[PDB]
Amino acid sequence: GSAVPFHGAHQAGIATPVQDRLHFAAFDVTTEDRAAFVALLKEWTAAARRLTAGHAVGEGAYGGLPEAPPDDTGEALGLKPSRLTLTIGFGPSLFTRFGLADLRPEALADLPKFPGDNLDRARSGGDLCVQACADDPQVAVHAIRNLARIGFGKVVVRWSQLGFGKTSSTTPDKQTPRNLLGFKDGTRNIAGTEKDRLDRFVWAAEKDGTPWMTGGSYLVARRIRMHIETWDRASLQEQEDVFGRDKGEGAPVGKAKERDEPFLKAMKPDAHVRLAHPDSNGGATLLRRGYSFTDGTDGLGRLDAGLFFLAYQRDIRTGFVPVQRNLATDALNEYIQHVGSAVFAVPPGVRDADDWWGSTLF
Amino acid sequence: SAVPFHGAHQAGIATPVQDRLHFAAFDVTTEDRAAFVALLKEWTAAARRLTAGHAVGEGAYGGLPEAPPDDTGEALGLKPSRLTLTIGFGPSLFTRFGLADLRPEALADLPKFPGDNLDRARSGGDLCVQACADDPQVAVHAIRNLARIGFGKVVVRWSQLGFGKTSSTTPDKQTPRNLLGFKDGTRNIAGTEKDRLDRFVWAAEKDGTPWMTGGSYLVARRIRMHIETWDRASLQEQEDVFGRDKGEGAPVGKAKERDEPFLKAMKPDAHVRLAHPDSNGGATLLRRGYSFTDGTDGLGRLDAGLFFLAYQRDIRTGFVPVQRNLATDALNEYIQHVGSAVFAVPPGVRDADDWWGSTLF
Ligand code: HEM
Numbered sequence: 064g065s066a067v068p069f070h071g072a073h074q075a076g077i078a079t080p081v082q083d084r085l086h087f088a089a090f091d092v093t094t095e096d097r098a099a100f101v102a103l104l105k106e107w108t109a110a111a112r113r114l115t116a117g118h119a120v121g122e123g124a125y126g127g128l129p130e131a132p133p134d135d136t137g138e139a140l141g142l143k144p145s146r147l148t149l150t151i152g153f154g155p156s157l158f159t160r161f162g163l164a165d166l167r168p169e170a171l172a173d174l175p176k177f178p179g180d181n182l183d184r185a186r187s188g189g190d191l192c193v194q195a196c197a198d199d200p201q202v203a204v205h206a207i208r209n210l211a212r213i214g215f216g217k218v219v220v221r222w223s224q225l226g227f228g229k230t231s232s233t234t235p236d237k238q239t240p241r242n243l244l245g246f247k248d249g250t251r252n253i254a255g256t257e258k259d260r261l262d263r264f265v266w267a268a269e270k271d272g273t274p275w276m277t278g279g280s281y282l283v284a285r286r287i288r289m290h291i292e293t294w295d296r297a298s299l300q301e302q303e304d305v306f307g308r309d310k311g312e313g314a315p316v317g318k319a320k321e322r323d324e325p326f327l328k329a330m331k332p333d334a335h336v337r338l339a340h341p342d343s344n345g346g347a348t349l350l351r352r353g354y355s356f357t358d359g360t361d362g363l364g365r366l367d368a369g370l371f372f373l374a375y376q377r378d379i380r381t382g383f384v385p386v387q388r389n390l391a392t393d394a395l396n397e398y399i400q401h402v403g404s405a406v407f408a409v410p411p412g413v414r415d416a417d418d419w420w421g422s423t424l425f
Numbered sequence: 426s427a428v429p430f431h432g433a434h435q436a437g438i439a440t441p442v443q444d445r446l447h448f449a450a451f452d453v454t455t456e457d458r459a460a461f462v463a464l465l466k467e468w469t470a471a472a473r474r475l476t477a478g479h480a481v482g483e484g485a486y487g488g489l490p491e492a493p494p495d496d497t498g499e500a501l502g503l504k505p506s507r508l509t510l511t512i513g514f515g516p517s518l519f520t521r522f523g524l525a526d527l528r529p530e531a532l533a534d535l536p537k538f539p540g541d542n543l544d545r546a547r548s549g550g551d552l553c554v555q556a557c558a559d560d561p562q563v564a565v566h567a568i569r570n571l572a573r574i575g576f577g578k579v580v581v582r583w584s585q586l587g588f589g590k591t592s593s594t595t596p597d598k599q600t601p602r603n604l605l606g607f608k609d610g611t612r613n614i615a616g617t618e619k620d621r622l623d624r625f626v627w628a629a630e631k632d633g634t635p636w637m638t639g640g641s642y643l644v645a646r647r648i649r650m651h652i653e654t655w656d657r658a659s660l661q662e663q664e665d666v667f668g669r670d671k672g673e674g675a676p677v678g679k680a681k682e683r684d685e686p687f688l689k690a691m692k693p694d695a696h697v698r699l700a701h702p703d704s705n706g707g708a709t710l711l712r713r714g715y716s717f718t719d720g721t722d723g724l725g726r727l728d729a730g731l732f733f734l735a736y737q738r739d740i741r742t743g744f745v746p747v748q749r750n751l752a753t754d755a756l757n758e759y760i761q762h763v764g765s766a767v768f769a770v771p772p773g774v775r776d777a778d779d780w781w782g783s784t785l786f
């Protein structure tokens with residue numbers, strides 16, 4: 064229930080241990096006034112400093128003037144910080160405004176068309192994003208709601224996604240969670256302690272060509288539907304072939320323990336792990352940080368389940384793109400469909416109480 | 426922590442309120458009474474396992490490689506998490522299997538209420554399973570696996586995820602707040618109040634339907650909140666809507682949340698004043714609802730609200746008179762009922778040989 068520090072060379076919410084709940088919001092900008100937008104970013108940073116510490120925004124949730132609306136909507140009163148992190152990102156479309164064209168990073172790459180793509184343009188894209196992660200879903204909702212409220216007239220929410228439970232891990236010493244296909248998800252990720260690997264694979268460096276992005280990262284988001292009726296009638300052997308690990312322990316095929324190193328030649332040629340492994344993609348490595356979702360029924364008598372997939376990397380062109388290209392033949396494709404997509408440049412961290420979100424860009 | 430599955434009553438009504446909810450309504454697709462009773466028996470066997478933290482059937486792995494596993498496996502390595510599984514039967518169930526003359530009179534169709542905007546597709550249902558637990562993945566796994574066991578005899582008509590408090594970080598005697606920022610639950614029937622449960626919640630044999638003795642009647646209302654409008658209202662308007670202050674949740678003119686209200690100090694159309702038993706001939710409800718937030722609609726607005734759940738001994742003397750009295754509720758400016766359903770919740774599963782619905786079938 065403790066707080067995660069807000070300041071740092073990097074934004075929290077990436078290498079931070081993965082909290083239980085997600086409320087992810089993408090926003091479109093509705094003002095042409097660069098000065099107005101910069102003022103918003105500063106006001107948003109001030110609110111985030113309050114929210115991540117478990118304090119109400121502005122002058123609080125009650126006790127102000129009776130005839131004025133409260134500054135904070137109040138549904139997080141009496142709750143602890145609950146490990147809330149708030150991570151902001153800038154979408155490619157944003158750089159068509161405020162004269163930012165020349166500052167769009169090369170590594171903020173548009174994604175190519177992938178086979179099987181069925182992307183809903185409504186729940187895709189976005190000028191910017193805010194990833195709210197916490198162990199308490201009310202805490203995460205309260206933060207998005209109050210950010211949106213502060214931004215009224217300058218931003219609007221384009222689409223949002225809640226994740227009811229994590230399917231990722233940055234802490235290999237704790238239990239690996241399972242996704243809705245029933246397999247452990249997150250075993251061979253990057254841990255928040257592996258500072259060497261985070262530098263090599265996640266954080267943008269000054270030499271990469273975009274100086275204002277040093278210390279930031281790049282985010283790929285893909286909403287993925289799961290064909291659970293199809294999956295749930297497949298044999299256990301079929302499910303285990305699809306991934307290359309057994310369902311119970313999550314060990315690589317042939318081995319006894321979850322964390323034993325995979326032996327790729329023992330897996331089928333189209334097994335998910337075999338195709339996704341760094342060694343199959345010239346060393347390309349990802350920080351996976353996704354969450355499970357369910358949004359009611361599908362209107363055809365079934366539950367609607369999926370995986371909201373999030374990956375951070377140092378360069379989209381050397382992370383998500385090569386790996387996802389290698390998944391064209393993935394056995395898993397038979398049970399999933401990508402139905403939403405967006406990319407964001409995640410700026411560096413807020414260094415101290417004088418700093419603000421996006422200050423290196425603006 | 427686990428909650429015993431067997432008892433004179435079904436669990437999940439008077440038992441401690443868990444952190445999360447997965448509520449599902451099912452429609453029946455078979456006409457065969459025997460096949461349906463068979464399913465009820467299979468569901469009961471599975472619920473015994475699920476509520477103890479065990480996988481269904483012969484497990485989620487380690488069986489024949491050529492067969493699908495009995496359990497879909499996403500709850501492996503998790504704890505029982507106080508899972509309760511509560512089943513109810515909708516009025517439309519009794520048009521099947523020759524049950525028409527066994528529908529309880531207390532399972533009454535709801536009138537149309539002013540301002541209703543009910544989405545047919547998120548209303549009704551032949552039966553429901555209320556799954557409550559502290560871990561949402563435990564609740565979802567339960568619904569997902571019951572549906573799979575029932576595939577071919579029942580379909581999922583609609584489904585609602587909910588959250589209340591998070592127990593790891595919040596004390597138990599602290600009242601949760603709803604998404605309007607007000608404490609919700611202050612004056613409610615508690616599960617410790619055996620006498621009030623008997624008077625207001627549990628069906629008695631003399632009530633008129635013997636197979637429902639020990640059961641209860643459930644009203645579900647999916648209530649959307651107009652969040653963005655509410656958040657523009659002044660602090661005074663918000664407190665005037667309810668008749669309590671927002672910070673402490675004390676009735677107007679009082680000092681503590683649990684001070685008994687003085688109804689005459691509240692505005693004539695304040696929510697607490699219209700909902701109070703003294704304003705409804707003594708009618709009292711057990712509220713057990715959950716907040717929801719499903720995402721955002723096509724106009725950028727938050728799709729959130731209160732999934733209202735009320736248990737009562739007779740719908741005609743519980744939910745209906747109180748809701749009728751809210752016709753002029755000042756809260757009506759800010760909410761909209763968009764889904765509704767009623768269910769008869771049968772008595773408990775007495776022992777290892779009993780099953781869901783045995784008193785009706
Ligand atoms: C619903 C969609 C998906 C499911 C259910 C899924 C499932 C899994 C599972 C069960 C594992 C094995 C345990 C581990 O995390 O190490 C895994 C590994 C992995 N997955 Fe996925 N995955 C999905 C989508 C994706 C996508 C879209 C990508 C990349 C574009 C990806 C990249 C990876 C990588 C890099 C690994 C680690 C392989 C290794 O280095 O050993 N996954 N995934």
Ligand code: HEM
Nearest residue numbers: 603607608609610611612648697700701702731747748760
């Ligand atoms: C979005 C919808 C609703 C909200 C936000 C809401 C909120 C509240 C709040 C804040 C209280 C005061 C604290 C408490 O004693 O629990 C309360 C009391 C109460 N509400 Fe509501 N309510 C809603 C809908 C309903 C409905 C539909 C009913 C019944 C049909 C209802 C019946 C009651 C009752 C019986 C009380 C107890 C009054 C007393 O004995 O003091 N509420 N509600």
